[PDB]
Amino acid sequence: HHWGYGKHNGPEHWHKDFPIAKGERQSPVDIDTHTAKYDPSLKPLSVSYDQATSLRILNNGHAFNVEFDDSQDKAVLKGGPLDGTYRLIQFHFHWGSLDGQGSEHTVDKKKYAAELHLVHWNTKYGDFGKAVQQPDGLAVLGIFLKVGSAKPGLQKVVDVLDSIKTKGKSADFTNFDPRGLLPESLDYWTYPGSLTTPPLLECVTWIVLKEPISVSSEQVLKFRKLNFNGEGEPEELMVDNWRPAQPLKNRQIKASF
Ligand SMILES: NS(=O)(=O)c1ccc(N[C@@H]2O[C@H](CO)[C@@H](O)[C@H](O)[C@H]2O)cc1
Ligand SMILES: [Cl-]
Ligand SMILES: [Zn+2]
């Protein structure tokens, strides 16, 4: 009985194996744009993905991870609310069964069709494992996806999905440039949160971009053809792999604009 997104193992059940699910800084959260406050102490955000080195794409049974070689300071995130350098380790998405839902964070309760998460770890901690034992160990850059025009930079990801349809499957995925998934503006909202799936560790500084990227209906439809199940097992389409908004509690969301 592994955690998942179903009726008997979904988000409302996670707290049993992961008590922190009801913690003080859980993610995602609803971003109330009018309550968010511009923060002048925020420094310019720096997304340096020019030397990013992707290696493989994996269907882990909950989503698919595009993994990067993080053995060196190549693709890094710094500036903004961040103190130090955060290295890109992987990116993945959360999406719905319908265009009307899919994102984890919401904006004034509005749900987007999907949400991209670029995961980074604070290099001051050596590696991801040590980073998730720290209050400022991770930084996840979240980007909303809306359905409209296709996102050219996303197509290479979409076309490789047929080779990793089921849980456990992976495929070589080198030379993918994540810069092709970024919107024009880097305006963002930021707040202290957690991983949105078990272990739900509260070590994330969330940076959610205001401008969503547009992807085509065809592109997201292919996301929906993936499977939660392993090869040879009954088909469970990988859809609605998002956690709903959690209590904001003692937190303030800051705006960079
Ligand atoms: N949705 S998220 O960006 O908050 C998120 C949720 C779970 C993870 N899980 C961790 O992702 C790392 C990189 O894939 C793994 O190394 C590590 O074991 C695993 O717990 C990462 C980001
Ligand atoms: Cl189901
Ligand atoms: Zn995520």
Curated annotation (Swiss-Prot):
<dbReference type="InterPro" id="IPR018338">
    <property type="entry name" value="Carbonic_anhydrase_a-class_CS"/>
</dbReference>
<feature type="modified residue" description="Phosphoserine">
    <location>
        <position position="163"/>
    </location>
</feature>
<dbReference type="GO" id="GO:0004089">
    <property type="term" value="F:carbonate dehydratase activity"/>
</dbReference>
<comment type="subunit">
    <text>Interacts with SLC4A4. Interaction with SLC4A7 regulates SLC4A7 transporter activity. Interacts with SLC26A6 isoform 4 (via C-terminus cytoplasmic domain).</text>
</comment>
<dbReference type="GO" id="GO:0045177">
    <property type="term" value="C:apical part of cell"/>
</dbReference>
<feature type="site" description="Fine-tunes the proton-transfer properties of H-64">
    <location>
        <position position="5"/>
    </location>
</feature>
<feature type="site" description="Fine-tunes the proton-transfer properties of H-64; involved in the binding of some activators, including histamine and L-histidine">
    <location>
        <position position="60"/>
    </location>
</feature>
<feature type="domain" description="Alpha-carbonic anhydrase">
    <location>
        <begin position="1"/>
        <end position="257"/>
    </location>
</feature>
<dbReference type="Pfam" id="PF00194">
    <property type="entry name" value="Carb_anhydrase"/>
</dbReference>
<feature type="binding site">
    <location>
        <position position="92"/>
    </location>
    <ligand>
        <name>Zn(2+)</name>
    </ligand>
</feature>
<keyword id="KW-0862">Zinc</keyword>
<keyword id="KW-0472">Membrane</keyword>
<feature type="binding site">
    <location>
        <position position="94"/>
    </location>
    <ligand>
        <name>Zn(2+)</name>
    </ligand>
</feature>
<feature type="binding site">
    <location>
        <position position="117"/>
    </location>
    <ligand>
        <name>Zn(2+)</name>
    </ligand>
</feature>
<keyword id="KW-0987">Osteopetrosis</keyword>
<keyword id="KW-0007">Acetylation</keyword>
<dbReference type="GO" id="GO:0044070">
    <property type="term" value="P:regulation of monoatomic anion transport"/>
</dbReference>
<dbReference type="GO" id="GO:0004064">
    <property type="term" value="F:arylesterase activity"/>
</dbReference>
<dbReference type="GO" id="GO:2001225">
    <property type="term" value="P:regulation of chloride transport"/>
</dbReference>
<dbReference type="GO" id="GO:2001150">
    <property type="term" value="P:positive regulation of dipeptide transmembrane transport"/>
</dbReference>
<dbReference type="GO" id="GO:0046903">
    <property type="term" value="P:secretion"/>
</dbReference>
<feature type="modified residue" description="Phosphoserine">
    <location>
        <position position="170"/>
    </location>
</feature>
<dbReference type="InterPro" id="IPR036398">
    <property type="entry name" value="CA_dom_sf"/>
</dbReference>
<dbReference type="GO" id="GO:0005737">
    <property type="term" value="C:cytoplasm"/>
</dbReference>
<dbReference type="GO" id="GO:0018820">
    <property type="term" value="F:cyanamide hydratase activity"/>
</dbReference>
<keyword id="KW-0479">Metal-binding</keyword>
<dbReference type="GO" id="GO:0070050">
    <property type="term" value="P:neuron cellular homeostasis"/>
</dbReference>
<feature type="site" description="Involved in the binding of some activators, including histamine and L-histidine">
    <location>
        <position position="90"/>
    </location>
</feature>
<protein>
    <recommendedName>
        <fullName>Carbonic anhydrase 2</fullName>
        <ecNumber>4.2.1.1</ecNumber>
        <ecNumber>4.2.1.69</ecNumber>
    </recommendedName>
</protein>
<feature type="active site" description="Proton donor/acceptor">
    <location>
        <position position="62"/>
    </location>
</feature>
<comment type="similarity">
    <text>Belongs to the alpha-carbonic anhydrase family.</text>
</comment>
<dbReference type="InterPro" id="IPR023561">
    <property type="entry name" value="Carbonic_anhydrase_a-class"/>
</dbReference>
<comment type="function">
    <text>Catalyzes the reversible hydration of carbon dioxide. Can also hydrate cyanamide to urea. Stimulates the chloride-bicarbonate exchange activity of SLC26A6. Essential for bone resorption and osteoclast differentiation. Involved in the regulation of fluid secretion into the anterior chamber of the eye. Contributes to intracellular pH regulation in the duodenal upper villous epithelium during proton-coupled peptide absorption.</text>
</comment>
<dbReference type="GO" id="GO:0008270">
    <property type="term" value="F:zinc ion binding"/>
</dbReference>
<dbReference type="GO" id="GO:0038166">
    <property type="term" value="P:angiotensin-activated signaling pathway"/>
</dbReference>
<dbReference type="GO" id="GO:0051453">
    <property type="term" value="P:regulation of intracellular pH"/>
</dbReference>
<dbReference type="InterPro" id="IPR001148">
    <property type="entry name" value="CA_dom"/>
</dbReference>
<keyword id="KW-1003">Cell membrane</keyword>
<feature type="binding site">
    <location>
        <begin position="196"/>
        <end position="197"/>
    </location>
    <ligand>
        <name>substrate</name>
    </ligand>
</feature>
<dbReference type="GO" id="GO:0015670">
    <property type="term" value="P:carbon dioxide transport"/>
</dbReference>
<keyword id="KW-0597">Phosphoprotein</keyword>
<dbReference type="GO" id="GO:0002009">
    <property type="term" value="P:morphogenesis of an epithelium"/>
</dbReference>
